[PDB]
Write a protein that binds this ligand. Structure first.
Ligand SMILES: [Zn+2]
Ligand SMILES: [Zn+2]
Ligand SMILES: [Zn+2]
Ligand SMILES: [Zn+2]
Lengths: 359, 362
């Protein structure tokens, strides 16, 4: 049950090298000569602590590894959208080319229908003209024919002698060529749908500011738009900061810390959405480029404040884009921060970072 | 009234005496008292009869000139009407020609688009391959550690021996821990394209059939060429240009030469003589007719075919009975006469008169 395998004795020792448990008879052998040993109790309670610490770190890395799972789980599904957009974009693009050809067709055709108007109008004119010149001839033949048959054929004839004596009568360019020119290159750049994130979003929307400033609303705030306190006391806001950073900041911080707060503010907001019953369903419904836009509206005016946009939360889940943009503009949130709301909407609209590529 | 006499003579309105004199120099007619008026006091007067046939001749000699100057005028009447349809063709050929080039291009797009989607699908396959790999390379890490943890969780409990046996290898491997990261394509270069921001037989026929070197419409709306050479009865132009090349033996592009026009003309006439001699309805007639009427017969078989002309029983019966007076009437009462009266007159004339009086003017 608990004895040395072979020697049949009590396992008391612990070789440092082998790191395995042995008995005193095991010690006097090949694999344990020159080896330092100890009794199990002399090393036990020390090792116990050593794994009590290994466990804790090993548990954090089990969270970090469970993030890398999610991380690429998102990227897969993201490309699925990236592709199934570049696809429509690429197709619809050609569709417009297929249109400009349809116009240029009937255009060039009516330029030939114009020649069938011009040359055809000089036709019926010089037709009727020389068609009477034919019957007017039968008018004189029938005349003389009955003029003959004396009173008839003489009533002025040396005039008709003078009458008869004066009877005078491709658009097609190398389209393949141009497409071969543009197919070459123009600007080979990174993706245009996941070359940015919720972080770079808010970095642009909130800016990074190291020393305490006042809000859009007037309140004290720091770093990547982290609210400190509604109070007018700069010190009180310094106090909250001092308390928030875990040192004596004095209303100014490192960028490294400015980031920490931001990661937390983001991540804290997210948990606010996962717990709120009205928000989450809309989150899971949207693509990444919009999943971030919800965090933005939450990061700004908090959980309870976004849940109120029920009229807007409906369309976006039903995915009526151009309309959800107009309904959000009627909320006070648009009135107060016009440019910010505009950028977030345009992102709820286009489903792209196009509202940010400027900045 | 009276026959073999002269019509009564009217009277000089200004004087009263009969109008009998032809004033030379004034070309008009007057009485004797009118010769004394100052209007003529110097003009050589003559009796109407003394000059009647001088002028009756002079008008006939002039009247014939009028008819022959009426033909060349009626020929320039058709000279225009021909050019009319000669452009109506030129357009309805350039019209289809362009709309066939605008299709060569729409084809070019279809293929380019096909080539572009065929690429956005290679990316998706390629990327969603390495991803679904490294993905499991993470399902490994996450699950693995959940088992590497359970090891410790097991040691931190139970026997001191369990806690201790081979414990170093673990605090080694855990200190030497570095979770790898997934193969992201977050920012690797890429390209999705940009749509840019944009007499006998042959002669008699040419007069009636004409000579065009390109595809023109018949007297019945069918595409023909040369001298009445039917390519097709279909209203398609592309259908004419296709059969045309099977005929000529080259790509004409809607235009042949004069020796190619005559090539297909001698193949049509040489068949008309056959179409008749191969027919037990017409051959009895063709043999019992002289050279001129034989042409008038071949003209009808060339115009309609051996089956069509063989539809004229009474006429062919009478032309065999040689009843010209009766036959010329039976050929007029026909759809052949209505569709082309001018040509019908010329053929029926060739049957009745037995001469070429129907082409001395054309
Ligand atoms: Zn032992
Ligand atoms: Zn040992
Ligand atoms: Zn008189
Ligand atoms: Zn006179």
């Amino acid at each position: 049950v608990d004895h040395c395998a072979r020697h049949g004795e009590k396992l008391l020792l612990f070789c440092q090298e082998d790191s395995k448990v042995i008995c005193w008879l095991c010690k006097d052998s090949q694999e344990h000569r020159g080896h330092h040993t100890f009794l199990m109790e002399e090393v036990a309670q020390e090792y116990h602590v050593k794994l009590q610490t290994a466990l804790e770190m090993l548990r954090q890395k089990q969270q970090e590894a469970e993030k890398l799972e999610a991380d690429i789980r998102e990227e897969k599904a993201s490309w699925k959208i990236q592709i199934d957009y570049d696809k429509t974009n690429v197709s619809a693009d050609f569709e417009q080319l297929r249109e400009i050809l349809d116009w240029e067709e009937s255009n060039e055709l009516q330029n030939l229908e114009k020649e069938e108007e011009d040359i055809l109008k000089s036709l019926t004119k010089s037709e009727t003209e020389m068609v009477q010149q034919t019957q007017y001839m039968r008018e004189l033949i029938s005349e003389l024919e009955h003029r003959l048959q004396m009173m008839d054929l003489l009533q002025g004839v040396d005039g008709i002698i003078k009458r008869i004596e004066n009877m005078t009568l491709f658009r097609a360019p190398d389209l393949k060529g141009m497409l071969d020119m543009f197919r070459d290159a123009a600007a080979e750049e990174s993706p245009v749908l996941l070359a940015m994130n919720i972080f770079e979003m808010l970095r642009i929307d909130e800016g990074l500011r190291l020393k305490i400033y006042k809000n859009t609303e007037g309140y004290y705030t720091i770093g990547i738009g982290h609210l400190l306190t509604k109070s007018p006391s700069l010190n009180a806001a310094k106090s909250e900061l001092d308390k928030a950073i875990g040192r004596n900041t004095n209303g100014v911080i490192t960028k490294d810390e400015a980031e920490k707060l931001f990661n937390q503010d983001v991540d804290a907001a997210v948990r606010g959405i996962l717990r709120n019953a009205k928000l989450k369903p809309v989150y899971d419904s949207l693509d990444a480029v919009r999943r971030a836009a919800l965090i933005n509206m939450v990061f700004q005016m908090g959980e309870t404040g976004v849940a109120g946009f029920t009229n807007s939360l409906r369309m976006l889940q039903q995915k009526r884009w151009d309309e959800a943009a107009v309904n959000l503009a009627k909320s006070r949130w648009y009135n107060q921060t016009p440019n910010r709301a505009k950028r977030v909407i345009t992102t709820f609209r286009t489903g792209t970072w196009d509202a940010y590529k400027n900045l």
